[PDB]
Design a protein around this nucleic acid. Structure first.
Ligand SMILES: [Zn+2]
Lengths: 61, 48, 255, 48, 82
RNA sequence: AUUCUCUCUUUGCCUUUUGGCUUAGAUCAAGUGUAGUAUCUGUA
RNA sequence: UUUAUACUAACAC
RNA sequence: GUAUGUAU
């Protein structure tokens, strides 16, 4: 019962929008805060950078 | 000195911490773990 | 190294005594330490004072006190909205610090001037842009209500004030654009009676004798009066509006 | 602080050829501790 | 008792191995769960009752080599996207 | 003959391993009992 | 009414 | 139940 003491933990852990024009800008604003913070945490870290642009084109351009 | 603090506030985060005994063991390492971050960068060839 | 300062504030005199003070107020826009320049204009006038740092009044281009643009003489906000030349837009507490610092970063390194030919071309263009844009049954039913001082002006406010005030002493005037009506109340009835007959069928009118949910009901009454004016000049919505027009008169008569 | 003065041309010497054996000879096996193995990340006893 | 106590430790061990999050992970996710749950009640109040301002830091493209027509089409597209 | 998608076989690529540093940084599972509240289980 | 868990604990020996 | 922050 050695390999079964590990696999039994995984299966136990395994089992365990938007309206208006105004309310979207709130949603859109908070995601900007999110992104800007992750830049301050890491000056360089291009994953956070690249993402941030992609996200803005789809919304605005 | 205290008045200038009271009509300005404290300057930008930095200035200089000036070691002391409490933070010598820490700051020793920090340098070693950035002089291996040097020597590797240069030991690794031009595209690996 | 005297300041920007226009000709307009320095004043009537040729000779002018004025005092610098190397670190007074940090600039309003810029939000950084600068020099205050004080002077008097006239005999018993309260003395002037520069409100901006030169770094800014370079970029913005105005009298470091008056803030009236040097070329024209109109305010700086008024200028940026209408002419839309440099197209600046922070208007915040903190962003306006950096934005305006960023333009001081721009102009100091590469001297990008304020071109006055292209500026004047914007004005003469804006000038031309302005010009291109630019009864018996009543009086009987009216007299029946008069026997049993306010005129309903059916079918702008300043002109409604101008044309009615010249026909008597006014008590008060109203308007609603969505309503598309204005209740002109006179001080006397002799004036309101006279103004009724004078302003009947006149341009600038149906001049009678007066009597979320509120927004949608008034906006519905706007579409009703719009089709009512359009039809008289010349179908289901017209019939549905007629049913709503009949329902309002029944509520008015009953109440 | 503001953004720096835009960078210059890099003008490197031409990149040397690498080969697939060289890029395998710099293979770095992730090391694992006797002591400091925080979080979870279970590892079998035949990899120790 | 002895059979029962063996089965207890065998279940406690399955909890230890399973989760490594720590105090800070559990308390940080509850803060998300509270904030998210708070909105869903707050947004329903809005329906019941019923950085953006000026860009963070501009950094202009580069220089006029070619570009005015490109900008003309871009302005009207944002209104359509709304 | 080319391009795109789906399926199978063989092979490649990783995220640093969950931020770092100290005397393994440091010590060792006798608690029980009552009262109240909340959740779950059974009784043509 | 019984059993378990946690919260009551800003308890008590 | 404070040290320490979140909302009006
Ligand atoms: Zn200034």
């Amino acid at each position: 019962x050695x390999x079964x003491x590990x696999x039994x933990x995984x299966x136990x852990x395994x089992x365990x929008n938007i309206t208006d024009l105004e309310e979207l800008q709130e949603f859109q604003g908070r995601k900007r805060k999110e992104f800007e913070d992750a830049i301050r945490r890491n000056r360089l870290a291009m994953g956070h950078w690249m993402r941030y642009g992609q996200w803005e084109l789809d919304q605005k351009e | 000195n205290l008045l200038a603090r009271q009509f300005e506030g404290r300057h930008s985060t930095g200035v200089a911490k000036q070691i002391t005994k409490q933070r010598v063991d820490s700051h020793q390492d920090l340098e070693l773990r950035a002089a291996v971050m040097n020597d590797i960068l240069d030991m690794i060839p031009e595209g690996i | 190294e005297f300041p920007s300062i226009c000709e307009r504030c320095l004043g009537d005199n040729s000779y002018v005594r004025m005092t610098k003070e190397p670190l007074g107020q940090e600039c309003k826009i810029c939000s950084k330490p600068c020099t205050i320049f004080r002077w008097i204009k006239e005999r018993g006038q309260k003395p002037g004072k520069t409100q901006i740092c030169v770094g800014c009044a370079r970029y913005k281009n105005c009298c470091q006190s008056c803030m009236l643009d040097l070329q024209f003489g109109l305010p700086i906000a008024l200028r940026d909205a209408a002419l839309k030349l440099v197209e600046s837009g922070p208007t915040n507490d903190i962003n306006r610090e950096f934005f305006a610092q960023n333009q001081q970063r721009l102009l100091s390194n590469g001297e990008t001037a304020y071109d006055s030919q292209e500026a004047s071309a914007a004005a003469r263009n804006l000038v031309k842009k302005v010009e291109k844009r630019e009864x018996x049954x009543x009086x009987x039913x009216x007299x029946x209500x008069x026997x049993x001082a306010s005129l309903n002006a059916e079918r702008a406010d300043y002109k409604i004030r101008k044309h009615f005030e010249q026909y008597g002493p006014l008590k008060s005037v109203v308007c609603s654009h969505r309503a598309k009506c204005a209740f002109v109340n006179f001080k006397t009835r002799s004036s309101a009676e006279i103004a009724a007959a004078a302003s009947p069928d006149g341009n600038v009118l149906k001049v009678q004798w007066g009597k979320x949910x509120x927004x949608x009901x008034x906006x519905x009454x706007x579409x009703x009066x719009x089709x009512x004016x359009x039809x008289x000049x010349x179908x289901x919505x017209x019939x549905x509006x007629x049913x709503x027009x009949x329902x309002x008169x029944x509520x008015x008569x009953x109440x | 602080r503001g953004p720096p003065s835009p960078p210059p041309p890099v003008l490197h010497s031409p990149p040397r050829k690498v080969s697939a054996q060289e890029q395998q000879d710099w293979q770095i096996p992730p090391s694992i501790s006797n002591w400091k193995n925080p979080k979870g990340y279970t590892i079998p006893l035949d990899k120790r | 008792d002895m059979d029962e106590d063996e089965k207890e430790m065998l279940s406690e061990a399955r909890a230890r191995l399973a989760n490594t999050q720590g105090k800070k992970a559990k308390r940080k996710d509850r803060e998300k769960q509270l904030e998210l749950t708070r909105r869903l009640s707050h947004l329903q109040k809005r329906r019941e009752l019923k950085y953006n301002a000026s860009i963070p830091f501009e950094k202009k493209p580069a220089i006029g080599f070619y570009x005015x027509x490109x900008x003309x089409x871009x302005x009207x597209x944002x209104x359509x996207x709304x």
